[PDB]
Amino acid sequence: SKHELSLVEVTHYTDPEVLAIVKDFHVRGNFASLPEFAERTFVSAVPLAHLEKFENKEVLFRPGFSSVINISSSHNFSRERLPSGINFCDKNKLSIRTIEKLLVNAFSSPDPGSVRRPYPSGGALYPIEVFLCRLSENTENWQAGTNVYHYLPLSQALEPVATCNTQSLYRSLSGGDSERLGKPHFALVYCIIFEKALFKYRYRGYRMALMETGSMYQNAVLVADQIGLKNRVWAGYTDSYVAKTMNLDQRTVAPLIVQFFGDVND
């Protein structure tokens, strides 16, 4: 509001050849991921059998050789990142205040007058937006009936986005694998405004945007761990369905990644 930017200003520098080509590419990685398509689609090109061969491995620059320079684990002062939560339970009530701690710490400065955020961005453009999705009736809500909000990292405020019911929003965001997912309390959805990602750096802005998105969800990963929230970054969702459900215009903005939050328990 104090720091508002109009996209009309952005669109003055847009190369439309670039925009079309980035969108055409982007859409190749969109999924059609629903329960009703589970038995007639697949996600993995590698069969279930052979998958563990590829998981949690190193590729070498000198395959077959082992002459390395070892580095001690005595230099490590961190925690182990917790296992990524699966099969979530919403037996407990979750406060707005706990969600507020996640959003403030992961995306905003401690000084509410500042503009420096806790992750960097190419050209200080910040083309990625965070939306918050209320997915459980046991989740506490700021404004009744409103289950989608948009977070303003500088203003440090929630902006109402949608009053779609809790069930629909969880249907869209969970895609085909909701059974295993369980019942999380909320989710952040990270989105690229294409024209803001492309207007200064052209094609390289897309790459810079997509990497920015990971810096964001990782701050969320790290922040969540510290306040006692299990989480899971999530890619199994129908991209256009989440957009429609969150009242997003896909010509302007698209969901890159969904991240789930809540407890895992009885």
């Binding site: 991921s33 009703e36 038995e39 007639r40 697949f42 429609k244 896909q250």
Partner: protein
């Protein structure tokens, strides 16, 4: 739902061979040949009750015959209700789909009605897939169909039509899922067909065109029986992928997408299309 898959059972005198997409098995049982003989007449779907009754007549263990028929590729269990209850085909050439309702039951494809575009007061149930096929294209035909059915609950549309030497099957337009409509597709194709050497198809030439009422037709070559025979098969297989007996799973990144076929070379091309900036399908 137990689906019957394509197989044959052939015998001369002594030997008996089951031939399926998965396997070829030398049947040494007498009851299993009987069951296999029974399943070959059954068109597409069959009830687990009826299967058990075929197995029980032949003295086969219900669970140990089901493991046979499943593993050899004669049948498969499927447990998930689809996104679209049923389908209808609306077309300017309904003659071309006269036998399709009967025939495509063995492909596991439930098509309730073949509808003529010339009809009035055509209704559609909730959660239907509307296949609009047009040999003589006109944008207004599609506008009429969208106007009528766009707000029908659970509805979704496919459109098929010809352009230059190609048979175009648009991606699935689901207002619920937020996918590109017909006009998003046809604009992808018309830009591509022009000699610009540029992806974005926008000058002041185009801006002036947009001032005129959006109506158009397409150039396309004369169809024979064979080009229709080709088209009929692609329509069936696309309906089968979406709503029918799955034979080969599709990846999630091209399940909803357009399919374009060159009628000369017979090459298919599956492409996901973006929303046209000027189209209004998202705003509705």
């Amino acid at each position: 739902m137990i689906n019957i898959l394509p197989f044959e059972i052939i015998s001369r005198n002594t030997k008996t061979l089951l031939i399926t997409y998965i396997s070829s098995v030398d049947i040494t049982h007498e009851g299993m040949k009987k069951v296999l003989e029974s399943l070959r007449s059954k068109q597409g779907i069959i009830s687990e009750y009826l299967l058990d009754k075929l197995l029980d007549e032949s003295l086969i263990d219900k669970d140990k015959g089901k493991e046979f028929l499943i593993t050899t590729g004669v049948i498969n269990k499927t447990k998930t209700s689809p996104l679209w209850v049923n389908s209808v085909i609306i077309s300017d050439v309904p003659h071309l789909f006269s036998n399709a309702r009967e025939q495509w039951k063995c492909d596991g494809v439930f098509v309730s009605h073949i509808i003529d575009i010339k009809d009035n007061n055509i209704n559609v149930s909730d959660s239907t897939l509307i296949w609009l096929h047009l040999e003589n294209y006109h944008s207004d035909i599609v506008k009429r169909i969208y106007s009528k059915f766009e707000s029908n609950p659970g509805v979704a549309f496919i459109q098929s039509y010809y352009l230059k030497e190609s048979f175009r099957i648009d991606g699935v337009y689901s207002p619920d899922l937020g996918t590109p409509c017909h006009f998003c597709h046809i604009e992808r194709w018309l830009s591509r067909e022009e000699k610009s050497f540029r992806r974005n198809e926008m000058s002041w030439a185009n801006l002036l065109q947009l001032l005129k009422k959006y109506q158009m037709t397409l150039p396309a070559l004369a169809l024979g029986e064979s080009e229709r025979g080709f088209s009929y098969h692609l329509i069936k297989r696309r309906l089968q992928e979406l709503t029918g007996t799955s034979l080969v799973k599709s990846h999630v990144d091209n399940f909803m997408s357009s399919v374009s076929a060159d009628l000369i070379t017979c090459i298919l091309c599956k492409e996901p299309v973006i929303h046209w900036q000027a189209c209004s399908c998202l705003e509705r």
